[PDB]
Design a protein around this nucleic acid. Sequence first.
RNA 1: UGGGGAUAGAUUAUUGCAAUUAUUAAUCUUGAACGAGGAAUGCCUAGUAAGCAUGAUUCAUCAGAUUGUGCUAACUACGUC
RNA 2: AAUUCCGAUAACGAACGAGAUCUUAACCUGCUAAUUAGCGGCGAGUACACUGUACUUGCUGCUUCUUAGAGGAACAUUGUGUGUCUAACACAAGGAAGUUUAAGGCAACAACAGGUCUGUGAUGUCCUUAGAUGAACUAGGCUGCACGCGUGCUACACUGA
Lengths: 154, 128, 138, 180, 48, 41, 58, 98
Amino acid sequence: RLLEPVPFVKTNNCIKDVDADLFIRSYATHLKLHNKITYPKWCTFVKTGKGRKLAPLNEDWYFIRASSILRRLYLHPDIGVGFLRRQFSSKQRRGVAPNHTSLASGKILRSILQQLENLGYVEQNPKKKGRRLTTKGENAINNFARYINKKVYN
Amino acid sequence: QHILRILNTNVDGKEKVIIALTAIKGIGKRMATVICKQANVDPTKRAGELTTEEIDNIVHIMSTPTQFKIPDWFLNRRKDLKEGKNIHVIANQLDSYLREDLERMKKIRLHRGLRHHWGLRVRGQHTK
Amino acid sequence: KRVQTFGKKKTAVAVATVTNGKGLIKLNGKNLDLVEPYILKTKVYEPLWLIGSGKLKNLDIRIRVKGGGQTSQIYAIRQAIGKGIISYYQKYVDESTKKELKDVLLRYDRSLLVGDTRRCEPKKFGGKGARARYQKSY
Amino acid sequence: DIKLFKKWSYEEINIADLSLVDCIAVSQKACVYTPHTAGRYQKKRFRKALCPIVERLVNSMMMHGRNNGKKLKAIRIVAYAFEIIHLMTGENPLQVFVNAVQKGGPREDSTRQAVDVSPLRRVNQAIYLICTGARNAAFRNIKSISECLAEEIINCANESSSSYAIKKKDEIERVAKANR
Amino acid sequence: VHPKKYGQGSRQCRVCSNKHAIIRKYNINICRQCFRERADIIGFKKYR
Amino acid sequence: KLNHAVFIVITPSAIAEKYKVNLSVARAVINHLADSQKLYT
Amino acid sequence: EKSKLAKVEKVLGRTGSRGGVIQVRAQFGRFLIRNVKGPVREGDILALLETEREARRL
Amino acid sequence: IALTSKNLRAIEKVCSDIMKGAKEKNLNVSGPVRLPVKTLRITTRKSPCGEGTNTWDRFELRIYKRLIDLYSQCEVVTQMTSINIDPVVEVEVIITDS
RNA sequence: UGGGGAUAGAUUAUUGCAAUUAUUAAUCUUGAACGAGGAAUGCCUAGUAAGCAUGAUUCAUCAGAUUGUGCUAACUACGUC
RNA sequence: AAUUCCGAUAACGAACGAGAUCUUAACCUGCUAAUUAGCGGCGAGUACACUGUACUUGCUGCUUCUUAGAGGAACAUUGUGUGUCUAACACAAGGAAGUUUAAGGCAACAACAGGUCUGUGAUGUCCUUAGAUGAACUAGGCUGCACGCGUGCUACACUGA
């Protein structure tokens, strides 16, 4: 499935050279295994955003959210919280009323961003306005991306 | 095994445990799910594999759930305006309380109580 | 050296940059396979399969896709690769070889060469649709 | 050389009523690796002939209410349906489709005295009958659509009363024969 | 008197003093019927 | 109405047909046997 | 029952109450006059059922 | 200078006249920069009253902006521009050292 | 049925002088009809139909409205009175 | 497509309408142009390879793509059929485009006692004017409901939630 024959030359030097999901799941799993970032306990009782209108119902999601956010940060080098809230937005059935997209819950996002920042992965600056990716994180993400690419490929 | 009856029917047993738990009250599902996690009966299994001890634990968690980590805002039947303060009150007791509140409204009198006594909806449907 | 060209289906635009290289192909910062739907993936690989693997081995290709939705982007990419390969051979390689190549692409499909020009018919009052109307009743 | 999904060869056919082969038109410039080609098919009356027979099958299959415009899922269902066909019975799926169209089309019908059915119309009607049969089967019915579509294609290819399309064709052909 | 500086009764057409049907887009402040009498000289020409 | 249960072509429908099982249980059997829809073994 | 073959040579005219019928000359003498339903082009081949039932031209 | 108008042809005439005027005197202009056209569109119900069919007309006010950056003494270029304009063209200052 | 979200019950917010006839908002709980619709009758021919959204208009606050705009891209002719 | 043309023809000649005009959208000018658009040029790192690829701060020929001015481009062009073989149509080819390229906008004559004085300081007459039908303030109400009819919204699930 994941492997298929290729008619052009792959580079395998970055996260931009490997599919989102495999990188995301493995990095999430690795992060939880290492135990760098907390659950945290209160986070199990709340929803990702109002378009869900239900429990998140998938256990390991917080690490996934962190993993996707980290990837988004390499993808787009300067962003803040609002960008995340907009990213993870989806559609909300309002019962009888029509659907609208509805923003993701900002505390859980704010907390993830803050934990990464504490661990040297991401950085609040004035030179570039919001959160950017920062150097220990940049190196780690790049290297982990190589480690995964080789491990998956053959 | 399968085909259980708890406080109310719960004959669910090929069915997943969490949805079986909903079948009492907490059909809103979040309340049932948080209680299931806190009780720590595992969502993976079918309801014919429930332990009696696990069911008792669920009743224990359900009873006054402020003392676990389940949030006060998340909790139903909150202020319940009186000198005291309340919690979600379950099943026939919940119905009894709702009925009690309607009885209080009829005595109290304001338009919602009066419409309710009469047999007419709360916000209006526009019956024209 | 380098030639730059485009493809345009619906409101999508895909710019193709065809330079001297080795056979590396990217789509924005990201490798060519990473575009998602497996069915429409084959459509974008389609010009590579019509032209074999040798011709790209001398050339690196960079692509920038902006605007339009999913189907529109795929066709715009497919179109841009077509327009790119043929234009590079007209400036740099050889006009007879280019004509042969153009013949192969034309023989398969004209849609690759020149985009479909269909675009929206405006909404007109008296109904939600472009031509569709509110339900009349007696 | 070229092959459908990288899986099905498309260099072999049977000759049908001769008309149907001319209409369905599996040939090199009508070949493509995957369904989804959206070229102008409403240019003139005859133009539907040039539209690939697999493309036509996907377009028809996508059609009905809530499922409209969701063309990639419909394509996914046909690809899976051919894969199911390949395993369930001993032939190449492309051939199984040719057999289904050759059996499936009704040849005579009545508007006022029965009249003959034109071959382009016969192909369209067959494709419609196969897809409508799949839809009738699918709804609320537990078995998945890829399998249900696969069952219609094999049963139509065989000729059976376990196909809606053959049953409907039988119904059309009998009424026309009786009327006229 | 007791006016409000918000809501429907707060405002009225610049030309005719009707309270209804006022274009406040671009801050025109004219009712649409009045606007139709003026629509060429203001520059709001018809085309397509 | 359901009459399928816990105990005794790799599609979920085929398994459900052969052994008279619910489709989640059919999936469970598939997973056991092996050791939305996608390529087959 | 069984198909037999005649090749459409010429389209004469569109007929019937709602216009859906078409008058056609078909080659199986070995001419056959037909009334056909649904779009027909010249060089189409038409599947016959009851083969001796030659039509009345209008 | 920056030129803003609701008359295309008037802006065009101004553009040519300052272009000729400058090019006599060897002046440095950065060639006519046409800004994206903005249209103020108003979507208007026809009929002052409801009756008859719902019939709308769509009004468009199309405004033209054009831009030239220039290195010279201000006074001559503004004087050449200001006398040569028709008042439907609105002239705004822009100036550079290179 | 974990479909369906009408209905109700309890909240804390937010706009406003004024929110009760629940303005609007979220949160938990509450879980109605409805199994593809009789007789009838509407719209539609290619980027349309359908499906999916969304910008703008009103706006102190209020889209299930209207008007724009895109994306997802069918069927069936291609004619007859 | 069209009292559009041809043709016939006690009429010949006209005019308005219609086409045409105009606004978009459709394609080409390696001409016209670079700002608050791109593209390169080039310094500098961070990352990986390996005799380039990915990613950020600083300076700064190109205009293909972003934008928008001017200008080009189809007339049924060529070929083949059908047609008084006349107006013209049909098919195939060429072509960015072949149903006047697609969409609009504009709206003859003569009407309707159609709609609107609840848009107007457009306006006749008739009513009213300090216990006002003026101006103005506080509540209530336009949404109430045995019940009848419109237009929409949301559904009835597994091509699904």
